[PDB]
Amino acid sequence: PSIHGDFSNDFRQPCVVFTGHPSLRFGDVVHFMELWGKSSLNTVIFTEPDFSYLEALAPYQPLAMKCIYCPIDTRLNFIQVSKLLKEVQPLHVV
Amino acid sequence: DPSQQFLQQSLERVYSLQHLDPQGAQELLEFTIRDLQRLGELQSELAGVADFSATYLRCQLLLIKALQEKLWNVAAPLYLKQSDLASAAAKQIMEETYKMEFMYSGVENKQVVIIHHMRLQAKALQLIVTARTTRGLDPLFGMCEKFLQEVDFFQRYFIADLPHLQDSFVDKLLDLMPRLMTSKPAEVVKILQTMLRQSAFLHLPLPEQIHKASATIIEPAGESDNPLRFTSGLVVALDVDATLEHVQDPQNTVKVQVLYPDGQAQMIHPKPADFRNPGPGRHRLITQVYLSHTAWTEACQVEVRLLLAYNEGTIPFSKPVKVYIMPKPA
Amino acid sequence: DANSALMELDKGLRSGKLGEQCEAVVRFPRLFQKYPFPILINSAFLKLADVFRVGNNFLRLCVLKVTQQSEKHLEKILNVDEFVKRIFSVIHSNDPVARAITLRMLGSLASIIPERKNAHHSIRQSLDSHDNVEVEAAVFAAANFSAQSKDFAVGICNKISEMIQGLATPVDLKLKLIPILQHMHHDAILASSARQLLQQLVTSYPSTKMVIVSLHTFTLLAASSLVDTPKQIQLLLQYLKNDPRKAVKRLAIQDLKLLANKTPHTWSRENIQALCECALQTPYDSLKLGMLSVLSTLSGTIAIKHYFRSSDLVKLAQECCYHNNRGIAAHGVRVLTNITVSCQEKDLLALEQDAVFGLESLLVLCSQDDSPGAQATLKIALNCMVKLAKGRPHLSQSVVETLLTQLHSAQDAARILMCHCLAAIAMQLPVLGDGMLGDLMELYKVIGRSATDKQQELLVSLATVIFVASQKALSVESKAVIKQQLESVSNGWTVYRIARQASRMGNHDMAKELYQSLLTQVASEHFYFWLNSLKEFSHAEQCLTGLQEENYSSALSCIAESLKFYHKGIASLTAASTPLNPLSFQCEFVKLRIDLLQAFSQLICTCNSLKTSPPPAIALQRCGRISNQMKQSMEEFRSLASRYGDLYQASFDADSATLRNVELQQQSCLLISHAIEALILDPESASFQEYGSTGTAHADSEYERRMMSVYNHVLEEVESLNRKYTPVSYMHTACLCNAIIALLKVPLSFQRYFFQKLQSTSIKLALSPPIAVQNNQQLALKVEGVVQHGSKPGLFRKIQSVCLNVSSTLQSNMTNEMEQRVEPHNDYFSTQFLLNFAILGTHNITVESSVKDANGIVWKTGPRTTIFVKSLEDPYSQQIRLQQQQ
Secondary structure (H helix, E strand, C coil): CCHHHHHCCCCCCCCCCCCCCCCCCCCHHHHHHHHHCCCCCCEEEECCCCCCHHHHCHHHCCCCCEEEECCCCCCCCHHHHHHHHHHHCCCCCC | CHHHHHHHHHHHHHHHCCCCCHHHHHHHHHHHHHHHHHHHHHCCCCHHHHHHHHHHHHHHHHHHHHHCCCCCCCCHHHCCCCCCCHHHHHHHHHHHHHHHHHCECCCCHHHHHHHHHHHHHHHHHHHHHHHHHCCCHHHHHHHHHHHHHHHHHHHHHCCCCHHHCCCCHHHHHHCCHHHHCCCCHHHHHHHHHHHHHCCCCCCCCCCCCCCECEEEECCCCCCCCCCEEEECCCEEEEEEEEEEECCCCHHHHEEEEEECCCCCEEEECCCHHHEEEEECCEEEEEEEEEEECCCECCCEEEEEEEEEECCCCEEECCCCEEEEEEEECC | CHHHHHHHHHHHHHCCCHHHHHHHHHHHHHHHHHCCCHHHHHHHHHHHHHHHHCCCHHHHHHHHHHHHHCCHHHHHCCCHHHHHHHHHHHHHCCCHHHHHHHHHHHHHCCCCCCCCHHHHHHHHHHHCCCCHHHHHHHHHHHHHHHHHCHHHHHHHHHHHHHHHHCCCCCHHHHHHHHHHHHHCCCCHHHHHHHHHHHHHHHHHCCCHHHHHHHHHHHHHHHHHCHHHHHHHHHHHHHHHHHCCCHHHHHHHHHHHHHHHHHCHHHCCHHHHHHHHHHHHHCCCHHHHHHHHHHHHHHHHCCHHHHHCCCCHHHHHHHHHHCCCCHHHHHHHHHHHHHHHHHCCCCCHHHHHHHHHHHHHHHHHHHCCCCCHHHHHHHHHHHHHHHHHHHHCHHHHHHHHHHHHHHHCCCCHHHHHHHHHHHHHHHHHCCCCHHHHHHHHHHHHHHHHHCCCCCHHHHHHHHHHHHHHHCCCCCCHHHHHHHHHHHHHHCCCHHHHHHHHHHHHCCCHHHHHHHHHHCCCCCCCHHHHHHHHHHHHHHHHHHHHHHCCCCCHHHHHHHHHHHHHHHHHHHHHHHHCCCCCCCCHHHHHHHHHHHHHHHHHHHHHHHHHHHHHCCCCCCCCCCCHHHHHHHHHHHHHHHHHHHHHHHHHHHCCCCCHHHHHHHHHHHHHHHHHHHHHHHHHHCCCCCCCCCCCCHHHCCCCCHHHHHHHHHHHHHHHHHHCCCCCCCCCCHHHHHHHHHHHHHHHHCCCCCCHHHHCCCCCEEECCEECCCEEEECCCEEEEEEEEEEEECCCCCCCCCECCCEEEEEEEECCCCCCCEEEECCCCCCEEEEEEEECCCCCCEEEEEECCEEEECCCCEEECCCCEEEEEEEECCHHHHHHHHHHCC
C-alpha cells in the first residue's frame, strides 16, 4: 500500500516497481525518481501516453537516469476508425 | 479568590515602584517574576495570565539589564562583543514578544499594542547596539530608516491606542518623529537611547480569560531503543499524536517540525482533517509523518517537535521528542 | 563488573545467617554508585524487595536504609508494579514492626509511586492504629505522600484535622501530626482549609510546644503557598507583640526572618511599622537583637523603599545604634547604613553623620576584646563602612581618618580587618595617597614585635594597603619594608604574598626586590622557574617606569630594555609549565604583552621613520613607505586586539577583575589602531562623535581609572585632530607617540587568575573512535562529555550550554559545518552527529565545544579534538562507477 508499510523492509535492490501517478507530480513515483535519478544504471519506462513524457521529466531534468518513451496506447487508431466508420456508415460524424 | 488578588497586587507592586534604583528595580523585577512563575505552578486557572505577565515582566527586566550595562560609557572604537549582553537581550526580548503575542489565547487590542510597543523598544535597542558596533554610514541609514518606517507603521496602526500610552516610549517618539528625519543619524541614536532610558513602564491590562497554548506529544513518546528499522533511501512512517490545548486555529497555524541529526529541519503542515476537536478548547493532532535518509553507521535519533506559525515566522511550541532511526542499507 | 558484583551480593543474601545478609543489603547502594545501569538497578531492587518480603525485621530495616540512601536510583526502576507489590504484601503481617517498616518503605518510595491508591489506604488505616511505632511510621509516610500526591493531601487533611481534634490522640502524637500540613501547598482551597485548621490549633491548644509547631508549619505552608504570606506576616507580628512567652517570640522572630529572607517585597509598611514598634517596646535584649536582625535583613532589600522622613524605623535605628550590647548596635548601624545608601532626601543628610559616628563607636568598642562575637560585630561594622563610603563617596575622608586614628590602638585581628576595609576604600578612590601612606608606614615599623600568629597576616594586609595607597616610586620606604621582612618574617610565603600584592598594584620595583630574594629558598624547579619569571616580569615593567613625556628616544630605549627582561621571563615561565597546572593563561597573557610592547616599539620606530626616511620623487600616496608601514601597524594592532579577545574568551574560570584587566588591554590595542586609522589612513570617513556617557565610568581600581583617563585623553586628542592636517604631518607622529608613552606610563597590573586559579572546569569529550567508513553509509557519531569541576562548580560563572561545533576537511574544505547546543542536565551531555564523506578520500574531523553561560556569553573553553576518518567505496560500487564513468 505504500513505501513505508512493509516495502520499506522487504525490498531488494535490482527490482521493477510499478507505482504512483504517470503525471510524476504526485505519488510514490516522485520519491522513486528522486531516489534513483542520480544513477545511470537505472531507468524509468513510460507507458501512459496522455501525459507528454518530456514534460513529466522536466522538474527532474538534470538526471542521468535513462528515460524510455514507449507508450502502450490501445485506443482506436485512424485506420481502425476509418474501417469502423465505413462499416457502420453514420450520416454524420462529430 | 485571593490568588487573583495576589496577582493584581504583584502587578501593581511592580508598576508603582518604577522609580527605583536600577539595582533595586532589577531585584523587584526578578522577585515578581519568581513569584508569578510559582503562582502559575500553584493554580492552574491563573497559569495562563501568570505566564503572560511573567513573560512581559521578563521583557522589561531584560531591557533594564541591557540599558544599564557598561557598554554606553566607552566610545565606539572600544566596543567589544565578547562582553556584550545587549544584543542577546534584544534578541531574547524580540522572541519573547512574539511568544507573548501568539502563544497565549484571549488577546485583545490593548494587550497587542502593549506587546507591539515592547517589540518596538526591542528593535530600538538592537538598532542602538548595531550602531555601536559599526562605523559605516550605509548600515546606520538603512536600519534607522527601516526603524522610523516601523515607528510610522506602529503609530498608524494604533491611532486609537495612542491617547492611552501616556509618558510612553512611543509618546516620546511621536514628539520627535516629524523632526528626527532632519537630524544626523548619530544624534538620532543619542536622542532615542536617552529617551529610551527614561521611558515609562507600560501597564499591561489583563484579559478576563486567557490560557497559554500547550502541546503534548504522546504517540512517539521517546520511550527507548529498538529504533525504526527501514531501508536506506526509502521512507519510514511515524505516527504522531498530540493533545493541543487552547489553540484557536491549529489547522492553519500548527506545523510539525523534525530535525535530523544535521542542519536539516524538515517542517510539515498536516492536513486540516487530522485536527480533531473532541472536547472544547483541546484538540487531537493524529498525524502520520514520513522520514527518510540514507544509510547510517548506526542508529541515531531525530528530534520531532511541534511548532507554532504566525502571520511567516514560527516559534517552538512543545517539548522536542527524539525518536531513534535505523536506516539499513538495502 | 556489574553482574559479578550483583551475583556476589545475591550470594550474600541467600547465606541464611543474618550477618552476611545485612552486609550484602547495605552493600547494595555502593554497587548502585559503581554501576548505575538501569537493568542492574531494576534487577537488584527486585531482589531487595524479595528479601524484604521474606526476612526478619532487621533485614527489612537494612533494606529501608538502602532505599532511603538510594532515592535517586529509584527513578530507574521499570518493574515498579512488581517491586511495590511484593514490598506491599508485608503490610498485612500482624507484626506491627513489620507494618512500620513497610509504611516507612512506602514513604521512601513516595517519589516513584505516588497515586498508588492501595498505599494511600494503608497510610490511612495505619494512622489510627494502636501500636505506637506503626502510627509514627504512618505519619512519616503520610508526610512523604502529601509532599508528592495532591489527591492524598486533600484526602488526608480531613483525617488529620479530625485526628488532632480527636481526644484519644495524645499530645506528642498531635505534635508529630501537625507538620504534615506544611505539604498542603498543592491548591488554593486546600491551603485555605489548612490555614483555618492551624488557626483552630493555636486557639484551642495554646501550649508552647504546640503553638510553636503549629505557627512554624503555618509559616512554611504560607511560604510555599504565596497567597497567604501577608496574613502570615501579620499573624507572626501579632504573636510577637502579644504572646508573652520568650520561646513563642523567638520563633516569631526566626520565622519572620525566614519570610523576610525569601519574600521581602511582600512586606508592607504596616508590617515594618509593627515590627519596629515591637522592637522599641521590648525590654529583652535577645528579642531586640532578633527582630533587629530581621530589620537589617529587610533594610538590605527593597522593603525600605516600599517603607517610604523621620519614622519609627529611623528612631529605632538611631536609638539602637548606640546600644550597650554590641550585636544590637551592629544591626542598628547596618540599618542606618542601608537607609543612608538607599535614599537621597534632604533629611538624610543629617542621618549620614549619625551613621558615621555610629561606625566610629563600633570601631572603638569592638577593636580590643578579640572575642569571636567581637569579630562578627567588627566585620558587620566594617562592611557597613565600605558600603557607605562606596555609596556616598563624599563621606569617605572622615571614614578613612577614623580608620587611621584607630589603626594604632586596635588589636592584631582588628588591624587585619581594618586594613582590609581601608584597602577596599582606597581601591575605590585614589585622592588620599601620600599622607595616609606615611601614617600606615609609621605603623608598619612596629609590626616586627606584635605577636607570633597574626603577625604574618597583619604584615600581608598592611603591605597590601601600603601598595594601594602608593601611586609612585619609593626607595627608602622600600628599604624599610625590605628590612622589616628580612628582620621579622624569614618565612617567604608572607614575602611571596606581599610580592603578589605589589605586582597587583603595579609596584614592580619592590616586587622585583622580593621575588629575587625568594629564588634561593624554593625547593622544586618548576616554582624556581615561576619565581624567576615573576622577577623578570617585575623588572621588565619597572624598566618602563623611566619613561618621559615627549622623549621618544628614551621611549625606544626603555621599551627595548623592558622587552629584553620580558623575553627572559617568558622563556623562564614556559620552562615552568607542567602536565598538572599548565600555565596557559600566564603564557598567553605574557605573550600578548610581548607582542603589544613589540608593536609599540615598531610604531615608535615608524613614527621616527617619518623623518628618518623621506619619501621618493613620486609626484596615502607621495608618502608610500610611511603609509604602508602605518597600514601594517594597523593590521598588527587589530590582530592584537583579536588575540586579547580570544584570550578573554578562553578565560572562563577567571574572576571578573582579571577579565576587566584583559578587556582593558584589548581596548588599549583598539585605541591605538583606531588612532592610527583616524589620523593617517581614513580620516575623511571616520566622522565619529565620541558621545559616550563618561560620567557613569565606575572605575573598579586605580589602575583601571588611569586606563580610562588615558583612553579619554587619547580619544579627545584624536578628535581635536580629525581633519586639521595632511595625514603625514609631524603632529600625527607626536599624537601617536604620546598615546603610546601615556599608555605605557601606567604600569601593568597582574590579577588573580595570573597567580591563583579558582573554579576550574574542563571537558573529557568522549566520542566514537585511521577509521574506514563506506561512502554511502554516512558516519553516525556519538559525542559525549562530562564537565569537571574544581571544588564548587558554580563559583563565578554558571554553565548551562555546550555549543559543540564540528567541521571537516579533506587531504589532511569545511564541508560539514554543523553544531548542536545541549544542556547537560546531570553535568554530562550526550548527542549525535551525522557526517557525510561522499568524497572517497580521507577526511579529518575537528570537533569543538564552546560554552554559553547563563547570561548568554560564549566561551571557547573546551578542548580541540581531532580524528582522521578514511572514506572509501565498496569494490562493487567502485567497479560499477568505473564501468559507468566511460
